[PDB]
Write a protein that binds this ligand. Structure first.
Ligand SMILES: O=C(O)COc1ccc(-c2nc3ccccc3c(=O)[nH]2)cc1
Ligand SMILES: [Zn+2]
Length: 208
């Protein structure tokens, strides 16, 4: 059911997604071990992910959440990096895309910082890096991230340095409690609460 539509670099939509990607890069406490060393990206392509069935799955669940939370879906646009990106865009998010060992239990994790999601493109901890060169900081190989529409509903706040969401909540928020520059991370426990809106193809760029 999925089609991918290329956005032109001239399109205001391309430009606003690129800006969110670039402006949410930060330094990581691993010095770049997982995701590589970079301050910005080379954006090669941005595609809209269009799947009627998956869209309707997401909006159905969004209405349920909304109606459980005084007509407030608490919808965000967040990044997701995954070795399963090509399955997610065709079949949607589900229990197979969960981070079983994540800090907030088995769920599907999203980030405000694009560079945090970049650490997962080649797997947990960056895995063994790119398939071609076995390099977590590869500057040649093309990487992909998703920029996703995510329904948080009532989110349980965890202050901090598939399972079920906590009773009375639709999600968990991991609030950064030590690194003052880190943005929040989020976890949902139902795949229907995210839609993989944009597929972004990019390279990390070697600092000069
Ligand atoms: O590789 C596996 O075994 C299961 O596959 C995955 C797939 C994705 C992520 C993942 N974790 C995150 C944690 C915090 C913030 C953002 C993210 C993110 O973007 N992706 C972890 C494991
Ligand atoms: Zn490579």
């Amino acid at each position: 059911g999925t089609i991918l539509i290329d956005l032109s670099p001239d399109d205001k939509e391309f430009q606003s997604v690129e800006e969110e990607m670039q402006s949410t890069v930060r330094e990581h406490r691993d010095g770049g071990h997982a995701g590589g060393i970079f301050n910005r990206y080379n954006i090669l392509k941005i595609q809209k992910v269009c799947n009627k069935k998956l869209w309707e799955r997401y909006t159905h669940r969004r209405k349920e959440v909304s109606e459980e939370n005084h007509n407030h879906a608490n919808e965000r646009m967040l990044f997701h990096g995954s070795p399963f990106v090509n399955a997610i865009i065709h079949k949607g998010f589900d229990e197979r895309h969960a981070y079983i060992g994540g800090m907030f239990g088995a769920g599907i994790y999203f980030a405000e910082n694009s560079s945090k999601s970049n650490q997962y493109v080649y797997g947990i901890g960056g895995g063994t890096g790119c398939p071609v060169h076995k390099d977590r900081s590869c500057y040649i190989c093309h990487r992909q991230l998703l920029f996703c529409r995510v329904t948080l509903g009532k989110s349980f706040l965890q202050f901090s340095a598939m399972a079920h969401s906590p009773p009375g909540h639709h999600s968990v928020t991991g609030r950064p409690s030590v690194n003052g520059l880190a943005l929040a991370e989020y976890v949902i426990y139902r795949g229907e609460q995210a839609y993989p809106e944009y597929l972004i193809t990019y390279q990390i760029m070697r600092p000069e």
